[model samples]
Target: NSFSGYLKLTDNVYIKNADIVEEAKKVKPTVVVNAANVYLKHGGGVAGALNKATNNAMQVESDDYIATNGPLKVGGSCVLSGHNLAKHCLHVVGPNVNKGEDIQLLKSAYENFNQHEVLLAPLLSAGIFGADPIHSLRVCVDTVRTNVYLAVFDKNLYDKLVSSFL
Candidate 1:
């Protein structure tokens, strides 16, 4: 089920339950942030969805990005032309919670979004990367900036965020 709505946070960003890529196509944000791996491989999760939505042009560009820039470190991010999805795609490598100081890295991921005014982003490190949603949201609330839209895909997480923010 799709449940997209605005739940404001600290006056700078809002959360919604929706498909990030689909919303990007519809709302056309300045940029979309992909919760990516260091290699920027668009094989699964948000990266895969973004690549598919862009008709694989994102993948080609990601390959070029990696070849030119090298593997991204945790908490680091890069930008690529968004092609069909939006104006740009910010590929952010979030920390694996199982490792060291992941929270700081996750914070950095959010901070990097300051480069753009409007952003459509996923809940970084809260998926297969195994981060607790509350921890992710906590860091998000502290670091979010400038008209951010959180496109959440899961109903439970959406409800949780709604309650937490309210």
Candidate 2:
């Protein structure tokens, strides 16, 4: 089951309590945010799920982009073809909280997108990168300048996010 609601930030933020790729397909946002590392390797976590949903097309595109331009810098973003769910995928390398300066870097990552386009994003850096999930959510909530759909996979986190949606 999935939970759906909205919270007002700079704009009305849509909250989807479900898998990012699955919700992306359902909601069909113009841009999907991939919580990536500096290497841009889509091997695990949210990246892996996206690659699976796209039948490896996402990874192939990432590989090509990385090969031509080298690894992505922290907080930097690159737009790529989103096979079906979205018109574009914005790959942003989030900061690992363990390394410090996490809040600003994460803000940079989430802030890198175009405000005019609808966005679908996961809880960036909250997975293996070691950032607290709610803290990660708060950063996105605070910095978003336009409408955003945040996809949360964990049930507990989802409920907490919805409760804290203000």
Candidate 3:
């Protein structure tokens, strides 16, 4: 039997009874943000496992996801690379590991999306490389346009990062 199911009665649309959030939530409990729905997951090299878990939790395709990386990966044309990697990726470029306009841009992005699904990945290297989670998440909450999912290896870090949005 299919772990989940969907029904298509029309050419352009269909109904799916898949609660990916419910599934991910079972694995990692978190306080769901009112402005955005958040799902948590572990980040290792296992793409399929993460994909299956998050798919079951957020009810969104893996393609509609975003992952974070530090300046090294997000250098000059890195945002373009991110955009290429997923449907949308926010590349926040900080100065000397400090927050600035990028945060505002991120907030704008989130606010613009009245009702969309978003996944946020915090690049831990940002801090060691020069940024921190507080700054990162601030940008995420301010700019996230729709539902938000925080994918991290550590549940504690994910919860702390997402708490601001609530």
Candidate 4:
């Protein structure tokens, strides 16, 4: 099924962008999974432009209650930062490049967090300062985190993480 489409796994876990606050009100998530800085783009080309587009898309879908931090392009990447308005932010950082261990750890932690009542993650990779979006998404998915706040970055990555975890 499409990542953007509604997902029904079981009676307990339903995936889609429903009212996160409403879910939290009912479930009361105790832990939050945060995948720290994932770079949105490298250099001021497609990646940079992609980051901007992603941010704009997120703005349309969610509200400002999510708090964002950057769109500041620095080094080789543009940083689009934000956090979930839920209980906790995981703040996970991927390894230097395509490090499987780091990615796996992130995934594990994210799954752990999902067991809680609510989970809120950020679109961390989309705001990376100097990295690639594909790589960022790979690392993010490998880590298996979820319930993203869909902050100011790669809408795809945010969508993926949220789909996997929820």
For each candidate in turn, the TM-score is 0.92, 0.88, 0.32, 0.31
Off by over 4 Å in 1: 1-4, 99-101
RMSD of each: 2.9, 2.9, 12.9, 10.9
Model 2 lDDT tens row, 38-62: 7778889999899889999888888
Q: State the lDDT of candidate 4 residue by residue for 7-107, as single tens digits.
A: 53334333444433333334434433333333322233222332233344423322232235333111112112322332442333433334333433333
* Best lDDT among the predictions, by candidate number: 1
lDDT of each: 0.82, 0.78, 0.33, 0.35
Error of 1 at 39 (Å): 0.7
lDDT, residue 71, candidate 2: 91
TM-score, ranked from best to worst: 1, 2, 3, 4
Displacement of residue 141 (Cα, Å) in model 1 is 1.0
Evaluate residue 164 in candidate 3 and report its C-alpha lDDT on the 0 to 100 scale: 39
lDDT of 3 by residue, 8-74 (tens): 2223222222233342344332222211111222232222243344343332332233344322222
lDDT for 136 (candidate 1)? 87
Off by over 4 Å in 4: 1-84, 95-118, 145-166
TM-score of candidate 4 relative to the true fold: 0.31
- Tens digit per residue, CA lDDT, model 1, 69-159: 8999899998889787777888888897775545668888778888887788898898778888877888887887666788889988888
lDDT of 4: 0.35
- If the candidates were sorted by their lDDT against the true structure, best first, what order would they fall in? 1, 2, 4, 3
Q: Whose lDDT is higher: candidate 2's or candidate 4's?
A: 2
